[PDB]
């Protein structure tokens, strides 16, 4: 499977792993 | 930064929890 963290599919992980939303960095 | 580690390489969950708030 494709482990790549990319555009929204980072927002969302991020999102998922951070609750409160984090930081753009 | 973020997009170099977690979209051109593969990040683990502890790298992408660095970027938390």
């Known amino acids: 499977v494709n482990q790549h963290l990319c555009g929204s599919h980072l927002v969302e992980a991020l999102y998922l792993v951070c609750g409160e939303r984090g930081f753009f960095p | ?21």
Request: glycine share 4%.
């Open chain 2, 1 to 21: 930064g973020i997009v170099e580690q977690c979209c051109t390489s593969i990040c683990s969950l502890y790298q992408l929890e660095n970027y938390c708030n």
